[PDB]
Ligand binder design. Structure first.
Ligand SMILES: [Cl-]
Ligand SMILES: [Cl-]
Ligand SMILES: [Cl-]
Ligand SMILES: [Cl-]
Ligand SMILES: [Cl-]
Ligand SMILES: [Cl-]
Ligand SMILES: [Cl-]
Ligand SMILES: [Cl-]
Ligand SMILES: [Cl-]
Ligand SMILES: [Cl-]
Ligand SMILES: [Cl-]
Lengths: 219, 216
């Protein structure tokens, strides 16, 4: 038959039984237990687009020697407080980690770096660490699915998309609940609705780009 | 040659051009002063729905009709009441304001539609799409025929970009324009194939990270 592409997507969604899902998660529970900065993969990388590079460099060299020039910019206030606390050896309460901003300018979280110096505090500071910094969770748990999510799946989850795919699981949103279905159900209902799909891939993007010109070899 | 890498072939491609044999040349430092970025980007002609609350955009449109009637709208609220109360504005106010009106376009274009006398003296503060179509060969003609990608490449000062039938090559502070045949000839000499950034592969039926399509 001939149903419109938006109508075939709605038909695809209506074929699912939300009570037959593998598991389900409440969006509000995810937002409460996992701040966005602890899910996005870019938080693990140096924050070279947030801070001036000189301040990241001044902070790095200050941490290596615990002496020298202090970056006193207001943007680097909390990273400076964290850096000088590790040097002298003063303690940082869990309340400080809750308001500090979580993410260190060099990549990663304050809590993980603090736990590397004080290993006994690792368990108590886990709620303030990036999901990639926490131990590998057991299969079937929420943290397991989050740790195996690519950047596209994370952004779709954070933005509350109607649906997204992560590995072999299809996530469907209805209200404040995400319902997970396996690959076989995803393929079956997409085939019943006369639909084909592909995940968002960088294979379309050209990586040899000058201005608005994509270059390629041609012998 | 065949042993040249893809970045090496691009350098060979650029070296094949005679910068003295260019069709025309423009100075970047002069383009930046004569044309602010907000007057070149095509999205400035559209309503600034990503910069102001939509309720605050409609209320600005309601007051513009019936001239009776916060801090995020401090500057455009001055313009709307100046338009209503007939307070003729100065060009120094345009060069100091944000130029772009929240409902799309520029302040100088809306101010020149009520007062069509100072229209010629307010062109440097209007968008290139609002100015009349320039004649071929002029700088404004090339700018008015640039797509969204060519505009961003020019503003970013890219090493090169293509716009229509011209190839723009940057050598320091000067952009040199070459014809389509010269572009295609030197690319073939360097063993290169090229294409413009296109949205023909961009997926517009997207739900999350899933791109949907009709099964054939
Ligand atoms: Cl439809
Ligand atoms: Cl110190
Ligand atoms: Cl301690
Ligand atoms: Cl502690
Ligand atoms: Cl969606
Ligand atoms: Cl929903
Ligand atoms: Cl490259
Ligand atoms: Cl190379
Ligand atoms: Cl470039
Ligand atoms: Cl398309
Ligand atoms: Cl759509």
């Amino acid at each position: 038959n001939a149903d419109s592409l938006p109508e075939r997507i709605d038909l695809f969604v209506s074929l699912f039984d939300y009570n037959s899902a593998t598991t389900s998660y409440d969006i509000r529970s995810i937002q409460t237990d996992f701040p966005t900065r602890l899910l996005t993969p870019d938080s693990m990388l140096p924050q070279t687009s947030e801070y001036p590079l000189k301040d990241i460099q001044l902070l790095y060299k200050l941490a290596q020697s615990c002496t020298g020039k202090l970056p006193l910019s207001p943007l680097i206030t909390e990273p400076l407080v964290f850096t000088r606390s590790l040097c002298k050896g003063s303690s940082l309460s869990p309340r400080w980690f809750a308001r500090s901003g979580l993410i260190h300018p060099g990549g990663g979280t304050y809590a993980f770096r603090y736990a590397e110096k004080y290993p006994a505090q690792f368990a108590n500071l886990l709620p303030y660490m990036h999901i990639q910094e926490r131990p590998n969770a057991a299969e079937g748990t929420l943290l397991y699915h989050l740790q195996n999510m690519g950047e596209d799946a994370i952004n779709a989850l954070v933005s509350g998309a109607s649906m997204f795919g992560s590995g072999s699981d299809l996530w469907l949103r209805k209200g404040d609940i995400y319902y997970l279905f396996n690959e076989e159900t995803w393929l079956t209902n997409a085939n019943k609705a006369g639909l084909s799909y592909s995940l968002l891939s960088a294979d379309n993007t050209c990586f040899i780009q000058r201005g608005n010109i994509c270059w390629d070899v041609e012998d």
